[PDB]
Design a protein around this ligand. Structure first.
Ligand SMILES: *[C@@H]1O[C@H](CO)[C@@H](O[C@@H]2O[C@H](CO)[C@@H](O[C@@H]3O[C@H](CO[C@H]4O[C@H](CO)[C@@H](O)[C@H](O)[C@@H]4O)[C@@H](O)[C@H](O[C@H]4O[C@H](CO)[C@@H](O)[C@H](O)[C@@H]4O[C@H]4O[C@H](CO)[C@@H](O)[C@H](O)[C@@H]4O)[C@@H]3O)[C@H](O)[C@H]2NC(C)=O)[C@H](O)[C@H]1NC(C)=O
Ligand SMILES: *[C@@H]1O[C@H](CO)[C@@H](O[C@@H]2O[C@H](CO)[C@@H](O)[C@H](O)[C@H]2NC(C)=O)[C@H](O)[C@H]1NC(C)=O
Ligand SMILES: *[C@@H]1O[C@H](CO)[C@@H](O[C@@H]2O[C@H](CO)[C@@H](O)[C@H](O)[C@H]2NC(C)=O)[C@H](O)[C@H]1NC(C)=O
Ligand SMILES: *[C@@H]1O[C@H](CO)[C@@H](O[C@@H]2O[C@H](CO)[C@@H](O)[C@H](O)[C@H]2NC(C)=O)[C@H](O)[C@H]1NC(C)=O
Ligand SMILES: *[C@@H]1O[C@H](CO)[C@@H](O[C@@H]2O[C@H](CO)[C@@H](O)[C@H](O)[C@H]2NC(C)=O)[C@H](O)[C@H]1NC(C)=O
Ligand code: NAG
Ligand code: NAG
Ligand code: NAG
Ligand code: CA
Ligand code: CA
Ligand code: CA
Ligand code: CA
Ligand code: CA
Ligand code: MG
Lengths: 359, 176, 593
């Protein structure tokens, strides 16, 4: 029974030791200290996932000014700031949309408006250093619509999170998925009403930058959504204008690595909301462990800057740059029968622990 | 912040050319679920259109500043025909003939316009809070955009778009 | 514990039809034979121009296993006007929900669309067909003049149905009034009598229904899933309805008075997006004569000690008490993303123990997410939280998960043996399977030793062959057994008696039977079930103190029994199972003093 910390040069800048090797016997335990040191001036990838359903027609134009102004504000929080853009509405199936031939491709037809055909999720702009391109992509964006109040937000989010090769998310960046909406989102089983009885497999299904399984697969569950967001190291910011802000706020305990705030009725805080959410997310440190090793139990306690202790993934708050947080990791073997991964949520570095054992 | 246009500006630009040294503004009708059906009701022979006089005055505050006014309605597919008449409100409780129209069997939505310059000027002068128009069949089977409250859900808000309005033209105060 | 999972009856439908999506039993009051009803919502019908209309098939059971469609609707889309269709039956999902009471079969098509007379629309109103006797009528309670989303235009009536013991039809239509949802309850007599094929909107006189409410209740989907049972002691089944997106998507279950729709009870979930109320069921699970309520919440996340949340699914089980109060406990799922609690189906008294048993599915659990059905036995204190039997799907995904356990129905005895059977759908593979319940044998095994106190010098008998005087004791045992259904009168049991086994293997046994000179003895026993215990006596002696580990020791007397399983079968080859809640290993002791 032992714990070995490699003496090799670390390949991690924030989370060390990058690798840990231990040996256990049943009834025995070993421990180590995991250190996390958040950086200043992170490269930041901000992707805008915008609700473009009819209820958002008063808000889409408010994004015409979240390009250059945001880029300037982020100059003091980031090293390299890129913007991307896409949009979502709902599943293009009955009963969520009208299927009448004269309005199926223009749900707003009855009001004599020129609305964009309804769609699930469309990727418009890959993350880019060119702010002008972002603004252009927004300025030429049309408004769509559907019938039912709830929108396919979670479905679009999953695709935005998993389709890394299409979005252009960088590993060497803080990945921020910004979701703009007003109403609540659909849940995994709501789709039964549309005759969709096939679980979301969590994979990437974009064809020509368009999600094409939106009418065959149901909405993702919160379980699946948080699983994929954490796995792809994506931090989520919910920006909600309506009273439903509170609905999203109260889902936060179920979705680790997620923050939510409110959009003002005049959308005067769109850039302030993104900046505050970013600054708040970087001050929260918590880890979780993916334990695929049978017979092994993990017990992790966070040691916070003020000397307080917080168990498991409860996390430490008010952590700054040049401020280290320690996690005391105890690993114990209970029974005879690989490795486990301990990672900070929202970080692009992990600690991999290999467990040798004998009986 | 030059470059893009806001919805209000682009919409006005297109509105002034939708029907086929002055400033132009628009005053939109009051929501039917807010005021139109609180003063009376809709009936299967007539329709009411109410406007907020204070809101109008904010755009054109004086009876001697107004140069022109038009009442704009969006007619929906009619198919065959309808003969209707438009009335002005007097003494806050009476209606009198103003003008009328023979409505064509349109296939698509179309904007109609009436010259109401004199009407608006009189209502602008009158120290009243509520002004409006009445339309009726010469029995009424022509639908126009808006005038409903049973529409909610995602399209709840766009319901108020392209609703009837007064298009007002007036002399700039600077030009006098 | 008594389902036969070794030789179940497997049925299949057309590929891609979702055969097995919805399953029920069909039992005409006096036709002598029973059928299984299996829906296939995406099946290709013979209807003139209808694509994937959906159908319900009536599957036989005895002798062979074949299924044939029921011609509830043999026509196509009726016109409203020349070259202007009234209705759209393609992709209506007929067979999505099927229920039957005696000879009355109600099958629904929740995705049926129609235009209404006012304007040329395409609204998903939903329709059902009720077949009884020799007549079939169309029931379409939401196909009225109250149209569009503000009305019943998007009702999807027939999404979920059940039957009231009073001969009423309870129908959920979750899309009504901007998805507030509506329950509609009518009479069978009115549905059949007030019928005219030339009339699209039909009024009924004895219909009960919910009404509209404030916009704050929009998108709740009331009537997503329904069940019935008496929750107020009036003798009239009341209406239980899931409302999965209610209360800030916590989910709720409502109980409405079955006579006047006055609301009686409200159950609310704890966790957002657990989708509490997805499915509901009602049955007496504790023998108290009061229906108990089972509420599924398939997306429930159960946090561990480290704060990590695992999506497992949950079922809320609440017992009804005379005071009007409910006693609620919680049953959690066992596997992540298996969606435990997505389907709940009362089995009736599966093991005939006096308490009803219930099946709860987890359609995406098990190896390769084939699907698992868990059988939970009842008892006087409420449902036993520990499952007694595990049913695993036997098919692999071809394009989608088999979803074994997606739809289940029990409490009907098809093989007529007194023990109700269970039908489980697996629509992802277009299959349905019937598991039959084995008879249960409860065994009373007796064991005595005479005397319990003896010693090495207490010479009381002589050995066979050579009359050597030895110390002795008599070993007595007896056996009785019975069941409550159809069991063979003669039960063939294998029994074995062991002496002085309480020691290290290889050690010399001191207590041996006189005739066999062995620490063990066995017999083939045939007993009459329900009769008196059959008795036998063996005589044992002790070896002297030349071969021993100690001198004063316990002598254990041990008896074990099991079934023969060669002659123990009914006329279909279905074998009985011993009660799994009783020991088949019993003991007594004698001592050397
Ligand atoms: C299980 O949980 C459900 C809720 O999920 C609960 O059912 C709800 O019961 C409440 C009543 O407690 C329903 O709310 C309203 O009830 C009034 C009846 O009068 C009461 O309330 C008024 C206050 O308004 C008091 O003064 C009075 O003394 C009573 O306490 C109804 O009249 C209401 O009807 C409205 O809707 C109708 C059409 O839908 C309208 O025609 C009618 O005019 C009302 O309109 C309202 O809203 C308008 C805006 O849209 C507004 O302009 C009007 O002025 C007015 O405010 C209404 O029914 C509630 O709807 C029930 N909800 C559901 C989903 O059924 C169960 O009782 C509970 N069960 C148990 C056992 O606890
Ligand atoms: C950022 O993107 C803008 C386009 O949004 C680029 O500007 C264009 O440059 C091309 C020449 O390559 C001209 O033909 C276009 O007319 C320009 N468009 C506009 C709107 O100015 C700009 O050069 C890009 N900048 C960088 C550094 O890549
Ligand atoms: C985690 O993110 C950090 C940046 O915040 C990555 O570190 C940078 O890697 C690039 C590689 O081209 C270097 O040029 C930078 O100088 C590094 N930054 C610092 C502050 O040292 C890090 O590599 C990411 N983790 C992984 C596993 O890729
Ligand atoms: C990290 O956790 C270990 C427990 O695994 C701590 O070790 C214990 O420290 C207390 C101090 O009061 C002793 O009484 C125990 O006997 C130690 N026990 C073990 C290994 O069983 C360790 O001190 C913690 N480190 C920090 C920095 O908090
Ligand atoms: C019911 O019949 C239709 C029509 O033949 C089937 O739909 C076709 O499926 C083939 C094979 O994938 C496609 O190449 C055709 O283009 C489809 N036609 C249409 C009109 O969609 C449908 O799959 C059949 N359904 C079942 C359950 O058998
Ligand atoms: C894990 O650590 C906490 C202290 O934060 C302690 O209370 C708890 O008992 C520990 N659990 C195990 C299983 O070691
Ligand atoms: C806690 O956060 C506040 C800002 O909200 C900051 O002013 C304060 O210094 C922080 N405390 C510590 C100990 O870092
Ligand atoms: C429904 O019936 C019960 C039982 O008689 C009665 O107490 C209740 O007041 C009735 N409610 C309505 C709305 O008729
Ligand atoms: Ca919607
Ligand atoms: Ca009752
Ligand atoms: Ca009970
Ligand atoms: Ca039982
Ligand atoms: Ca049986
Ligand atoms: Mg919307």
């Amino acid at each position: 029974v032992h714990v070995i910390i490699p003496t090799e040069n670390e390949i991690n800048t924030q989370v060390t030791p990058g690798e840990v090797s231990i040996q256990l016997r049943p009834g025995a335990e070993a421990n180590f200290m995991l250190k996390v040191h958040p950086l200043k001036k992170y490269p930041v990838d901000l992707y805008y996932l915008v609700d473009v359903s009819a209820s958002m027609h008063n808000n889409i134009e408010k994004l015409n000014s979240v390009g250059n102004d945001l880029s300037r504000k982020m100059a003091f929080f980031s090293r390299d700031f890129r913007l991307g853009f896409g949009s979502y509405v709902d599943k293009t199936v009955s009963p969520y949309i009208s299927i009448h031939p004269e309005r199926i491709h223009n749900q707003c037809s009855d009001y004599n408006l020129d609305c964009m055909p309804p769609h699930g999720y469309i990727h418009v702009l890959s993350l880019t250093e060119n702010i002008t391109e972002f603004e252009k992509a927004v300025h030429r964006q049309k408004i769509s619509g559907n019938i039912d109040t709830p929108e396919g937000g979670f479905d679009a989010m999953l695709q935005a999170a998993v389709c890394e090769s299409h979005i252009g998310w960088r590993k060497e960046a803080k990945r921020l998925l910004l979701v703009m909406t007003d109403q609540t989102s659909h849940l995994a089983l709501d789709s039964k009403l549309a005759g969709i009885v096939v679980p979301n497999d969590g994979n990437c299904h974009l064809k020509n930058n368009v999600y094409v399984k939106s009418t065959t697969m149901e909405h993702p569950s919160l379980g699946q959504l948080s699983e994929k967001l954490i796995d792809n190291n994506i931090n989520v910011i919910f920006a909600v204008q309506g009273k439903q802000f509170h609905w999203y706020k109260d889902l936060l305990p179920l979705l680790p690595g997620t923050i939510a705030g409110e959009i003002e009725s005049k959308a005067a805080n769109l850039n302030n909301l993104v900046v505050e959410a970013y600054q708040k997310l970087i001050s929260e440190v918590k880890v979780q462990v993916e334990n695929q090793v049978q017979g092994i139990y993990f017990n992790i306690t966070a040691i916070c800057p003020d000397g307080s202790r917080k168990p498991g993934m409860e996390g430490c708050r008010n952590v700054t740059s040049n401020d280290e947080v320690l996690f005391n990791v105890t690993v114990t073997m209970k029974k005879c029968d690989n490795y486990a991964i301990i990672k900070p949520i929202g970080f692009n570095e992990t600690a991999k622990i290999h467990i040798h054992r004998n009986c | 912040p030059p470059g893009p246009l806001p919805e209000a500006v682009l919409a006005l630009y297109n509105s002034t050319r939708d029907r086929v040294a002055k400033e132009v503004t628009r005053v939109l009708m009051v929501e039917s679920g807010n005021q139109i059906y609180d003063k009376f009701k809709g009936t299967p022979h007539s329709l009411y259109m109410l406007f907020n006089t204070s809101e109008l005055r904010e755009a054109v505050p004086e009876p001697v500043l107004l140069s022109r006014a038009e009442l704009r309605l969006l007619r929906l597919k009619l198919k065959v025909e309808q003969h209707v008449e438009l009335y002005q409100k007097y003494s806050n409780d009476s209606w009198r003939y103003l003008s009328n129209r023979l409505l064509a069997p349109s296939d698509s939505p179309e904007w109609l316009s009436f010259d109401v310059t004199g009407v608006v000027r009189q209502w602008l002068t009158r120290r009243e809070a509520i002004e409006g128009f009445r339309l009726s069949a010469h029995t009424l089977h022509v639908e126009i955009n808006g005038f409903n409250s049973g529409r909610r859900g995602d399209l709840a808000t766009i319901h108020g778009m392209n609703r009837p309005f007064l298009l007002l033209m007036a002399t700039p105060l600077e030009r006098a | 514990f008594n389902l036969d999972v070794d030789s179940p009856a497997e049925y299949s439908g057309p590929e891609g039809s979702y055969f097995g999506f919805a399953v029920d039993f069909f039992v005409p009051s006096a036709s002598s034979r029973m059928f299984l009803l299996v829906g296939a919502p995406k099946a290709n019908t013979t209807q003139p121009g209808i694509v994937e209309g959906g159908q319900v098939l009536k599957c036989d059971w005895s002798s062979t296993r074949r299924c044939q469609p029921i011609e509830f609707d043999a026509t196509g889309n009726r016109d409203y006007a020349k070259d202007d269709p009234l209705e759209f039956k393609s992709h209506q999902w007929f067979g999505a929900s099927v229920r039957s009471k005696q000879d009355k079969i109600l099958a629904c098509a929740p995705l049926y669309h129609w235009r209404t007379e006012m304007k040329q629309e395409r609204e998903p109103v939903g329709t059902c067909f009720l077949q009884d006797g020799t007549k079939t009528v169309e029931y379409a309670p939401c196909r009225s003049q109250d149209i569009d989303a503000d009305g019943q235009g998007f009702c999807q009536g027939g999404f979920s149905i059940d039957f009231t013991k009073a001969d009423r039809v309870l129908l959920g239509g979750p899309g009504s009034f901007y998805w507030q949802g509506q329950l509609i309850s009518d009479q069978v007599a009115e549905i059949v009598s007030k019928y005219d094929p030339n009339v699209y909107s039909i009024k009924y006189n004895n219909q009960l229904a919910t009404r509209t409410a404030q916009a704050i209740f929009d998108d709740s989907y009331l009537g997503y899933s329904v069940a019935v049972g008496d929750f107020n002691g009036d003798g009239i089944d009341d209406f239980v309805s899931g409302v999965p997106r209610a209360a800030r998507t916590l989910g709720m279950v409502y109980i409405y008075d079955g006579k006047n729709m006055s609301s009686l009870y409200n159950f609310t979930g704890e966790q957002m997006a657990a989708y509490f109320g997805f499915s509901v069921a009602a049955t007496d699970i504790n023998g108290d004569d009061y229906a108990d309520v089972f509420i599924g919440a398939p997306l429930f996340m159960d946090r561990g000690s480290d704060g990590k949340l695992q999506e497992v699914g949950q079922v809320s089980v609440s017992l009804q008490r005379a005071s009007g109060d409910f006693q609620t406990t919680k049953l959690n799922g066992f596997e992540v993303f298996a969606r435990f609690g997505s389907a709940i189906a009362p089995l009736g008294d599966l093991d005939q123990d006096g308490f009803n048993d219930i099946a709860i599915a987890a359609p995406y659990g098990g190896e390769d997410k084939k699907g698992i059905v868990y059988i939970f036995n009842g008892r006087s204190t409420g449902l036993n939280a520990v499952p007694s039997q595990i049913l695993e799907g036997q098919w692999a995904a071809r394009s989608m998960p088999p979803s074994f356990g997606y739809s289940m129905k029990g409490a009907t005895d098809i093989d007529k043996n007194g023990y109700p059977d269970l039908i489980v759908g697996a629509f992802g593979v277009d299959r349905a399977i019937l598991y039959r319940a084995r008879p249960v044998i409860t065994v009373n095994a007796g064991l005595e030793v005479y005397p319990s106190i003896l010693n090495q010098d207490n010479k009381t008998c002589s050995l066979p062959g050579t009359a050597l005087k030895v110390s002795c004791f008599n070993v007595r045992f007896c056996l009785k057994a019975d069941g409550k259904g159809v069991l063979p009168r003669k039960l063939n049991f294998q029994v074995e008696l062991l002496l002085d086994k309480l020691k290290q293997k290889g050690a010399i046994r001191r207590a041996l039977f006189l005739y066999s000179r062995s620490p063990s003895h066995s017999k083939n026993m045939t007993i009459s079930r329900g009769g008196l215990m059959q008795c036998e006596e063996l005589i044992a002696y002790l070896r002297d103190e030349s071969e021993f580990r100690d001198k004063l020791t316990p002598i254990t007397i041990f008896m074990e029994y099991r079934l023969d399983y060669r002659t123990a079968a009914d006329t279909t080859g279905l074998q009985p199972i011993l009660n799994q809640f009783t020991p088949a290993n019993i003991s007594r002791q004698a001592h050397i003093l």
